Structure 1
Amino acid sequence: MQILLANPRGFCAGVDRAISIVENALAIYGAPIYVRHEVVHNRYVVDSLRERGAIFIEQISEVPDGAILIFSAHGVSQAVRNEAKSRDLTVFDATCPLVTKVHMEVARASRRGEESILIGHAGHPEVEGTMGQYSNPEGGMYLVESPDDVWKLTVKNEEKLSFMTQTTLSVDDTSDVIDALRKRFPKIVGPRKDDICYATTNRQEAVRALAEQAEVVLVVGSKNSSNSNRLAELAQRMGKRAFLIDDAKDIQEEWVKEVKCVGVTAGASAPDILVQNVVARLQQLGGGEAIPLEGREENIVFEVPKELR
């Protein structure tokens, strides 16, 4: 059994910064540090930090007066940011710079009273944060998930309209939604392509190359990691069996029985120790040395705030 490893895979620059932010806050100020929502969608990363006395909560009401609160890498609405400001809390913001960039565009559209369409998945905290940058009742902020949603959307002024995207979407699907928006709303204004970030594009491109060679693809990532799910979905649509797994214990022998080539990748929030343990388990079920595929180089790093050292 040949084991192939996708490249790039695993931590992106926003995740690495968000994890550092919490760790350094814990090191500067001690336990407890409160965090609103899982800092990133990875059970191991979360369990890690939690067992080291970060405390994860879903609402600012659960955080005590005088405490330190960190916002997750997915970002938060204006209302959440205001609710923390109107409380007694010291706040550090771990929102990824690439999410903040999309926030700034929505806020701009809002000030101008111009209507905005976000492409994204309803209920995801990034979508809640991003939609929550829009406050002008003169305009409007609308969410679409698919070409069908576009086909049924009506807006107040289609001459003054822009669109933005969630950063972790399927490159291919989003492209279909943009083609629909442009046909429905010829004057809509957006980015040249989308707001999908470099790490999301790169992991999709890497898993496409992997799935070309591998019969089965295992994607290391938690169930609620949107970007991890896109990697698995991509492989599946190429007709490969693909499984989203949190760790090596999830691997079922039947998945890899009589398989000549198995590929492994990891979502943007999954630590490399998890991939190492998965490779050790596949070697137990008969695979040889893991071979890394050649891939696009990534060179971007986002530093913690100078306050966090």
Structure 2
Amino acid sequence: MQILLANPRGFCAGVDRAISIVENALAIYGAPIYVRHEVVHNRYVVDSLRERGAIFIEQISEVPDGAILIFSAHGVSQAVRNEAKSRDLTVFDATCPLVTKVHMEVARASRRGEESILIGHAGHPEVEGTMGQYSNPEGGMYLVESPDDVWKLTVKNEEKLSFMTQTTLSVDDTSDVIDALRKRFPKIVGPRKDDICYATTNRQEAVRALAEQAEVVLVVGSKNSSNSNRLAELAQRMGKRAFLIDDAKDIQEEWVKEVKCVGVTAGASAPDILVQNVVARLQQLGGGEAIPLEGREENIVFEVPKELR
């Protein structure tokens, strides 16, 4: 069994920054450190930070007066931010800059009372954070997940309409949604393509190359990781058996039993150690040396705020 590794895979710049933010805050202020939502959607990262004194919460009200609070990388609504500000809290913001950039455009359209459309998945914290940057009731903010959603949407003023997207979507599916938006709303404005980040684009492209070669694809990522799900989904649509797994323990022998070629990748929130352990498990099942595929070299880094060193 050949073991192939997708390139790129694993940590993006946003995730690495956000984790370091919580780690550094723990190191300088000691435990506990309050974090609104899982800092990134990875069970190993979160349980580790929790064992080190991070307390993960959904709402500001469960955070005590005087505490240190950190927003997760997925971002937060304006309502959340102001509730946090209104309280006696010391606030660090770990939202990825690439999320913030989308937020600022939404805020712009709000100030103008001009309607905006967000392509995203309902209930996802990044969508709630992004939708929550709009508040001017003279306009509006609408969520669409699919072309069918577009085909049902009515707006107040189609001549002044803009769109934004979640950063972790399927590149292919989002192209279909945007196509629909422009056919229905010919005057709609947006970025040149979408707001899907380099990391999401790159990892989907890399899983594409991976599954052209491999018969089975293992995607390291937690169940609530949207971008990780997109990788598994992508490979499955190409007709490959593909599994989303947290660690090597999740691997069932039947999945690879008589497979000559298995591919492995990881979502943007999964640490490399999980992949090495997955590989280690595959080698117990007759896998050889892991061969990393050639891939686009990522070079972007987001520094922690100076205050956090």
SS of residue paired to 1:139: coil
User: How many Å separate the matches in 1 of 2:71 and 2:208?
Assistant: 33
Question: After TM superposition, which residue ranges in structure 1, 4 or more long, deviate above 6 angstroms?
Answer: none
Task: Quote the offset at 1:304 in angstroms.
Answer: 0.4
Gaps in structure 1 of 5+ consecutive residues? none
Task: Quote the offset at 1:259 in angstroms.
Answer: 0.1
Task: Quote the offset at 1:227 in angstroms.
Answer: 0.2
TM-score, L = length of structure 2: 1.00
| Partner residue in 2 for 1:152 | 152
User: How many Å separate the matches in 1 of 2:224 and 2:156?
Assistant: 34
Task: Quote the offset at 1:172 in angstroms.
Answer: 0.1
User: How many Å separate the matches in 2 of 1:69 and 1:140?
Assistant: 30
User: How many Å separate the matches in 1 of 2:140 and 2:110?
Assistant: 8
Task: Quote the offset at 1:99 in angstroms.
Answer: 0.1
Task: Quote the offset at 1:49 in angstroms.
Answer: 0.5
Gaps in structure 2 of 5+ consecutive residues? none
1:204-248 deviation line (CA, Å, top 9, x unaligned): 000000000000000000000000000000000000000000000
User: How many Å separate the matches in 2 of 1:177 and 1:277?
Assistant: 38
Task: Quote the offset at 1:8 in angstroms.
Answer: 0.1
Task: Quote the offset at 1:95 in angstroms.
Answer: 0.3
User: How many Å separate the matches in 2 of 1:48 and 1:291?
Assistant: 29
SS of residue paired to 1:123: coil
SS of residue paired to 1:17: helix
Task: Quote the offset at 1:123 in angstroms.
Answer: 0.2
| Partner residue in 2 for 1:50 | 50
Task: Quote the offset at 1:32 in angstroms.
Answer: 0.2
5 Å matches for 1:207-218?
A: 207-218=207-218
Task: Quote the offset at 1:104 in angstroms.
Answer: 0.2
TM-score, L = length of structure 1: 1.00
Task: Quote the offset at 1:70 in angstroms.
Answer: 0.1
User: How many Å separate the matches in 1 of 2:24 and 2:224?
Assistant: 25
Task: Quote the offset at 1:126 in angstroms.
Answer: 0.1
Compute the RMSD of aligned alpha carbons: 0.3
SS of residue paired to 1:223: coil
| Partner residue in 2 for 1:242 | 242
Task: Quote the offset at 1:186 in angstroms.
Answer: 0.1
User: How many Å separate the matches in 2 of 1:205 and 1:11?
Assistant: 16
1:71-128 deviation line (CA, Å, top 9, x unaligned): 0000000000010011000000000000000000000000011100000000000000
User: How many Å separate the matches in 2 of 1:99 and 1:87?
Assistant: 24
User: How many Å separate the matches in 2 of 1:173 and 1:33?
Assistant: 38
SS of residue paired to 2:169: coil
5 Å matches for 1:1-309?
A: 1-309=1-309
SS of residue paired to 1:156: coil
1:46-81 deviation line (CA, Å, top 9, x unaligned): 001000001101111110000000000000000000
1:170-197 deviation line (CA, Å, top 9, x unaligned): 0000000000000000000000000000
User: How many Å separate the matches in 2 of 1:261 and 1:119?
Assistant: 36
SS of residue paired to 2:103: helix
